[PDB]
Design a protein around this ligand. Structure first.
Ligand SMILES: Cc1cc2nc3c(=O)[nH]c(=O)nc-3n(C[C@H](O)[C@H](O)[C@H](O)COP(=O)(O)O)c2cc1C
Ligand SMILES: Cc1cc2nc3c(=O)[nH]c(=O)nc-3n(C[C@H](O)[C@H](O)[C@H](O)COP(=O)(O)O)c2cc1C
Ligand SMILES: O=C(O)c1cc(=O)[nH]c(=O)[nH]1
Ligand SMILES: O=C(O)c1cc(=O)[nH]c(=O)[nH]1
Ligand SMILES: [Mg+2]
Ligand SMILES: [Mg+2]
Lengths: 311, 311
């Protein structure tokens, strides 16, 4: 019922992990492969291995999560070797996704060049929105810098590429970004990364709950679903059909998934909920979405994809 | 216990209504005056009376609210005439706040000039963040336009003035805005207005829940507290001490209030919670905050104001 076509590839269902969650090591990735997830993506990588910010850096909240991980990752070479090797094996339905988050334009270009030259046949996700790198703002909030980077990327990168975007809150910003992105042979847009620089306080201790950046961190979970759905929908009505969408943000139940799909998302990523529940979440949410479809008499996602009604 | 000094004026407590909530008519305002609120503010006004966006425009949500009112208001002259006659009665402890949200820079300048020329002795709040007027983005997301407007404003406005700001999610943005604001003799900054252009969906009807702008509206309530607290704290550590802060966003309990004060807010505004509960909320939240202070052995807000601890 959930069979999905995305990036000219076929997936059993639209569910995936969100980059950064349960995808740090080969062991984590193999657990996602064994789960019911339709597809999975690697932790955003940098050219070299990176330690990350001081702990505590992640905290579970009643309405979601707050985090300032700081891009801890095992490095580009580590992830490229895993994907190449799981590619040669033909042991899964649908390609693996590879996320990169260079700490400079040159770094992103270097990793993209390596992917282009390698035998990698999967999908790449360029992260333009990490809100937890001290001194390095979200690139996608700088429209000029974003367009400049993408123009250089497309002068040589021919493989499937998507961009992970931060949430926008002004309609003109959606217009500007859509006009920048529509000029490229981009495969997809993934909205949204965490709501940047939020704060959570322990009132009894009168202090913040994470160590990095004086307690400021990316917000995920139920707190952000309204923003996530809005971003998915706003881009769905502005992007050229050639650019599909991956919806991310506040997905915990089949109903949350149904809502993202109504908005126009094709693939769906789970962050916070997966962090709390583990890979078993995929079997649960798949069953919940199928039940919603059964009650409505839908046998395919096409029966409601992007059909959100206005009043 | 809650006695507060703000804008060189004395207030019984820091609580106020948030502009837009329970402050449309003289009757609403008189009800706020009779309540236990330390101060109150008028609905943002425009030069001409406005009907507002088509209904339904406001919906109560489990985690907050979504709205696209569209600045319905009785017009600048209506509110000015009211505050001018009330001021003369000397019937309350502390000035009334007057909010303005002109459709254009020219409209804001015209209203500010009328306030300057009038005998108004209260406090004015310039709203640079309404996210619900079709085709009119939040001015405060355009740093150049914001600085330009404020420079003209201060060539003539000498009365107390604060600015209502939209939420920011990137530290560099707080730096830019702080640099801009610190060059002016502003009285305060009010963070934050609703999280703009969010979306809420009724999964059973497969439809949005508000009529304007295809269902996109400002988000308030529990959903936005992490963002609201972060904005209050980020400006508290960046603004010159002459510019105080009013904290707005997700305040429903004494604990929420305590958190805003710990961040650096001096006055506190309640929107969504007041919309749902009515003016009786002030008596409830005041007692909740005093109980928190009593348990901690605090006898004044100064005992913890801005004392949020980092790890
Ligand atoms: C602990 C943690 C680490 C994350 N790491 C990444 C990352 O490396 N790359 C990326 O694009 N997003 C990262 N994200 C953001 C997610 O991919 C996702 O966009 C976000 O958590 C919003 O989804 P949610 O509401 O399901 O949590 C991370 C989120 C969390 C909580
Ligand atoms: C129905 C409604 C009308 C509002 N009208 C205004 C307005 O005229 N001017 C303004 O500055 N803010 C307005 N706001 C925003 C609030 O003042 C407040 O910033 C927002 O709701 C965040 O606070 P909350 O979490 O307590 O709701 C409005 C909010 C709502 C829900
Ligand atoms: O690793 C991180 O800090 C991180 C990166 C990113 O893109 N998003 C997030 O929430 N955290
Ligand atoms: O009247 C409105 O639509 C409105 C104005 C504003 O500044 N904020 C908000 O949430 N609504
Ligand atoms: Mg599997
Ligand atoms: Mg009173």
């Amino acid at each position: 019922m959930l069979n999905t076509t995305f990036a000219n590839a076929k997936f059993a269902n639209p569910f995936m992990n969100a980059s950064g969650v349960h995808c740090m090591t080969i062991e984590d990735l193999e657990e996602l492969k064994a789960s019911q997830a339709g597809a999975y993506i690697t932790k955003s990588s940098t050219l070299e291995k990176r330690e990350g910010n001081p702990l505590p850096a992640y905290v579970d909240l009643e309405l979601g999560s707050i985090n300032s991980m700081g891009l801890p990752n095992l490095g580009f070479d580590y992830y490229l070797d895993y994907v190449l090797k799981n590619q040669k094996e033909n042991a899964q339905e649908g390609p693996i996704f590879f996320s990169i988050a260079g700490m400079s334009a040159a770094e992103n270009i270097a990793m993209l060049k390596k992917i282009q030259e390698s035998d990698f046949s999967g999908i790449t996700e360029l992260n333009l929105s990490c809100p937890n790198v001290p001194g390095k703002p979200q690139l996608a909030y700088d429209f000029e810098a974003t367009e400049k980077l993408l123009k250089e990327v497309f002068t040589f990168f021919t493989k499937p590429l998507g961009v992970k975007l931060p949430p926008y809150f002004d309609l003109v910003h959606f217009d500007i970004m859509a006009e920048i992105l529509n000029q490229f042979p981009l495969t997809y847009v993934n909205s949204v990364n965490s709501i940047g620089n939020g704060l959570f306080i322990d009132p009894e201790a009168e202090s913040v709950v994470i160590k990095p950046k004086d307690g400021f961190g990316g917000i995920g979970g139920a707190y952000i679903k309204p923003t996530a759905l809005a971003n998915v929908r706003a881009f769905y009505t502005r992007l050229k059909p050639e650019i599909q969408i991956i919806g991310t943000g506040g997905i915990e139940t089949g109903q949350d998934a149904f809502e993202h799909l109504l908005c126009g998302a094709t693939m769906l990523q789970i962050g916070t909920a997966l962090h709390k529940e583990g890979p078993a979440i995929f079997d649960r949410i798949i069953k919940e979405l199928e039940e919603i479809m059964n009650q409505k008499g839908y046998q395919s996602i096409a029966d409601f994809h992007g059909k959100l009604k206005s009043l």
